Design an enzyme around this catalytic site. Structure first.
Site, PDB file in Angstrom:
ATOM      1  N   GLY A  28       0.826  -1.221   0.000  1.00 15.07           N
ATOM      2  CA  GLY A  28       0.000   0.000   0.000  1.00 15.07           C
ATOM      3  C   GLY A  28       0.852   1.260   0.000  1.00 15.07           C
ATOM      4  O   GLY A  28       2.071   1.151  -0.173  1.00 15.07           O
ATOM      5  N   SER A  29       0.215   2.417   0.170  1.00  9.99           N
ATOM      6  CA  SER A  29       0.858   3.759   0.178  1.00  9.99           C
ATOM      7  C   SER A  29       1.796   3.894   1.376  1.00  9.99           C
ATOM      8  O   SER A  29       2.849   4.539   1.233  1.00  9.99           O
ATOM      9  CB  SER A  29      -0.172   4.853   0.212  1.00  9.99           C
ATOM     10  OG  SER A  29      -0.128   5.593  -0.984  1.00  9.99           O
ATOM     11  N   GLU A  97      -2.944 -10.025  14.187  1.00  9.88           N
ATOM     12  CA  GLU A  97      -3.456 -11.397  13.940  1.00  9.88           C
ATOM     13  C   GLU A  97      -3.382 -11.645  12.434  1.00  9.88           C
ATOM     14  O   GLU A  97      -3.751 -10.757  11.659  1.00  9.88           O
ATOM     15  CB  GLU A  97      -4.894 -11.581  14.470  1.00  9.88           C
ATOM     16  CG  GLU A  97      -5.645 -10.268  14.753  1.00  9.88           C
ATOM     17  CD  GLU A  97      -7.151 -10.319  15.050  1.00  9.88           C
ATOM     18  OE1 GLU A  97      -7.773  -9.211  15.189  1.00  9.88           O
ATOM     19  OE2 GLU A  97      -7.721 -11.447  15.155  1.00  9.88           O
ATOM     20  N   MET A  98      -2.921 -12.814  12.021  1.00  6.06           N
ATOM     21  CA  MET A  98      -3.065 -13.242  10.614  1.00  6.06           C
ATOM     22  C   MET A  98      -4.566 -13.438  10.343  1.00  6.06           C
ATOM     23  O   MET A  98      -5.248 -14.058  11.190  1.00  6.06           O
ATOM     24  CB  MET A  98      -2.293 -14.528  10.345  1.00  6.06           C
ATOM     25  CG  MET A  98      -2.108 -14.765   8.871  1.00  6.06           C
ATOM     26  SD  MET A  98      -0.796 -13.722   8.187  1.00  6.06           S
ATOM     27  CE  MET A  98      -0.985 -14.146   6.455  1.00  6.06           C
ATOM     28  N   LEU A  99      -5.061 -12.842   9.257  1.00  7.81           N
ATOM     29  CA  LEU A  99      -6.498 -12.809   8.878  1.00  7.81           C
ATOM     30  C   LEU A  99      -6.659 -13.416   7.485  1.00  7.81           C
ATOM     31  O   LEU A  99      -5.644 -13.747   6.869  1.00  7.81           O
ATOM     32  CB  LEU A  99      -6.987 -11.355   8.876  1.00  7.81           C
ATOM     33  CG  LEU A  99      -7.392 -10.748  10.218  1.00  7.81           C
ATOM     34  CD1 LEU A  99      -8.232  -9.512   9.971  1.00  7.81           C
ATOM     35  CD2 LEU A  99      -8.165 -11.738  11.076  1.00  7.81           C
ATOM     36  N   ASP A 145     -11.584   5.624   5.838  1.00 14.70           N
ATOM     37  CA  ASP A 145     -11.181   4.913   4.591  1.00 14.70           C
ATOM     38  C   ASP A 145     -11.909   3.573   4.502  1.00 14.70           C
ATOM     39  O   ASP A 145     -11.285   2.592   4.073  1.00 14.70           O
ATOM     40  CB  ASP A 145      -9.656   4.769   4.447  1.00 14.70           C
ATOM     41  CG  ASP A 145      -9.199   4.513   3.012  1.00 14.70           C
ATOM     42  OD1 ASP A 145      -9.919   4.924   2.093  1.00 14.70           O
ATOM     43  OD2 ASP A 145      -8.140   3.878   2.818  1.00 14.70           O
TER      44      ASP A 145
HETATM   45  C1  LIG Z   1      -3.755 -11.703   5.885  1.00 20.62           C
HETATM   46  C2  LIG Z   1      -3.797 -10.478   6.715  1.00 20.62           C
HETATM   47  N1  LIG Z   1      -3.985 -10.431   8.022  1.00 20.62           N
HETATM   48  C3  LIG Z   1      -3.956  -9.074   8.345  1.00 20.62           C
HETATM   49  C4  LIG Z   1      -4.109  -8.392   9.540  1.00 20.62           C
HETATM   50  C5  LIG Z   1      -4.010  -7.033   9.511  1.00 20.62           C
HETATM   51  C6  LIG Z   1      -3.757  -6.354   8.301  1.00 20.62           C
HETATM   52  C7  LIG Z   1      -3.698  -4.880   8.245  1.00 20.62           C
HETATM   53  C8  LIG Z   1      -3.417  -4.207   7.061  1.00 20.62           C
HETATM   54  C9  LIG Z   1      -3.409  -2.795   7.056  1.00 20.62           C
HETATM   55  N2  LIG Z   1      -3.133  -2.135   5.920  1.00 20.62           N
HETATM   56  N3  LIG Z   1      -3.698  -2.070   8.167  1.00 20.62           N
HETATM   57  C10 LIG Z   1      -4.002  -2.730   9.307  1.00 20.62           C
HETATM   58  N4  LIG Z   1      -4.282  -2.009  10.413  1.00 20.62           N
HETATM   59  C11 LIG Z   1      -4.008  -4.134   9.373  1.00 20.62           C
HETATM   60  N5  LIG Z   1      -3.637  -7.011   7.133  1.00 20.62           N
HETATM   61  C12 LIG Z   1      -3.731  -8.327   7.199  1.00 20.62           C
HETATM   62  N6  LIG Z   1      -3.556  -9.237   6.200  1.00 20.62           N
HETATM   63  C13 LIG Z   1      -3.444  -8.878   4.802  1.00 20.62           C
HETATM   64  C14 LIG Z   1      -4.783  -8.483   4.241  1.00 20.62           C
HETATM   65  C15 LIG Z   1      -5.602  -9.643   3.720  1.00 20.62           C
HETATM   66  O1  LIG Z   1      -4.581  -7.562   3.160  1.00 20.62           O
HETATM   67  C16 LIG Z   1      -4.600  -6.245   3.407  1.00 20.62           C
HETATM   68  C17 LIG Z   1      -5.536  -5.500   4.116  1.00 20.62           C
HETATM   69  C18 LIG Z   1      -5.382  -4.137   4.152  1.00 20.62           C
HETATM   70  C19 LIG Z   1      -4.329  -3.534   3.484  1.00 20.62           C
HETATM   71  C20 LIG Z   1      -3.480  -4.378   2.801  1.00 20.62           C
HETATM   72 BR1  LIG Z   1      -2.000  -3.726   1.802  1.00 20.62          BR
HETATM   73  N7  LIG Z   1      -3.604  -5.684   2.762  1.00 20.62           N
END
Ligand SMILES: Cc1nc2ccc(-c3cc(N)nc(N)c3)nc2n1C[C@H](C)Oc1cccc(Br)n1
Length: 333
Positions: A28-29, A97-99, A145
């Protein structure tokens, strides 16, 4: 020697004898996101890596403070949990946390046909409960956002969601940026250069719930002017009391002698693109695909359309707030 703002990511390397970097899981940015194994905690984490650039560092300090504030008012209900942050190799690093994947990826999985009204309602309940918690007096947090890409599935098998990226978030009365929100989800008050409150998030949610069911953005403007025109197509000319205060009203509209606003000369006539027809309420849903299918009745569609129009009220003072949106007939069992 680091060249500019980029951290050079190497897979397999272990940070501070704790994080085993696995792969780049996003960009991202603000910098980048990596999948890493935490040896201490024996689990998977997503590490957001902030670019080594002053503007982004300052905004990420506000992200840490707001994430810490929100996580202190807990048990967990619908906001991503910040495990901890640390400085590594001159980059601020935020551990999450991994999501699972985002709601735009979920739509792309089913060829942008859209999710069922039943799934849309579960996403709407969690989003409205999330916006209710942000509106808590101790928080007063404006996400700023909201989009499908900042809404993550906990797991690909379930519908539980978490809101992520508080990178442009501010508290009520601490507005610092004229230019906020992804253009498709940008509220009229932000397009008009007006001050904003927690109501701009409810506007984003309205646009998002329609897109999840239809599979396409409600308002797909190419630029600010195109965006405003696409909104007027559906909602008509904004109330004169709003345009009379808007610094950027004369970016899209013009006052007539009698004192009524119309669109800048150089789209469908204002308010003629009915959400009723965009939802295909009586003609079998988005692209007619939900014809006769259970849970997609005219009565079900009318409650959903009702709630969406309350979310897209031009007046931020009369836009439905999280608490009243949860009392809506579209949610009663
Ligand atoms: C797999 C996973 N677990 C996550 C947990 C947290 C975050 C995350 C990302 C950002 N930008 N800000 C916060 N506060 C938390 N991002 C995760 N991701 C990547 C998610 C799917 O992609 C994403 C999601 C958003 C932005 C981006 Br690049 N990619």
């Amino acid at each position: 020697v680091p060249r500019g703002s980029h951290m050079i990511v190497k897979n397999g390397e272990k940070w501070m004898d704790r994080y085993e970097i696995d792969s780049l899981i996003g960009k991202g940015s603000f910098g980048q996101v990596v999948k890493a194994y935490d040896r201490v905690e024996q689990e998977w984490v997503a590490i957001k890596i902030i670019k080594n650039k002053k503007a982004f560092l300052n905004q990420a300090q506000i992200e840490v403070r707001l994430l810490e504030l929100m996580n202190k008012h807990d048990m967990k209900y619908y906001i991503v949990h910040l495990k901890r942050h640390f400085m590594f190799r001159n980059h601020l690093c935020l551990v999450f946390e991994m999501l699972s994947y985002n709601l735009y990826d979920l739509l792309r999985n089913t060829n942008f046909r859209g999710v069922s009204l039943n799934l849309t309602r579960k996403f709407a309940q969690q989003m409205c409960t999330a916006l209710l918690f942000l509106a808590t007096p101790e928080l007063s947090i404006i996400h700023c956002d909201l989009k499908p890409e900042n809404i993550l599935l906990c797991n690909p098998k379930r519908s539980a969601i978490k809101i992520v990226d508080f990178g442009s978030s501010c508290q009520l009365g601490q507005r610092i940026y004229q230019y906020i929100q992804s253009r498709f989800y940008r509220s009229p008050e932000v397009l008009l250069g007006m001050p904003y409150d927690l109501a701009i998030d409810m506007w984003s949610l309205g646009c998002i719930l329609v897109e999840m069911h239809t599979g396409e953005p409600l308002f797909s403007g190419a630029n600010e002017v195109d965006q405003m025109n696409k909104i007027v197509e559906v909602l008509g000319i904004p109330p004169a009391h709003i345009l009379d205060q808007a610094p950027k009203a004369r970016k899209f509209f013009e006052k007539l002698p009698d004192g009524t606003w119309n669109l800048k000369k150089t789209y469908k006539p204002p308010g003629t693109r009915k959400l009723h027809n965009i939802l295909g309420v009586e003609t079998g849903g988005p692209g007619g695909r939900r014809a006769g299918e259970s849970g997609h009745t005219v009565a079900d569609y009318l409650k959903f359309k009702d709630l969406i129009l309350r979310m897209l009220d031009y007046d931020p003072k009369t836009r439905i707030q999280p608490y009243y949106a949860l009392q809506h007939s579209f949610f009663k069992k």
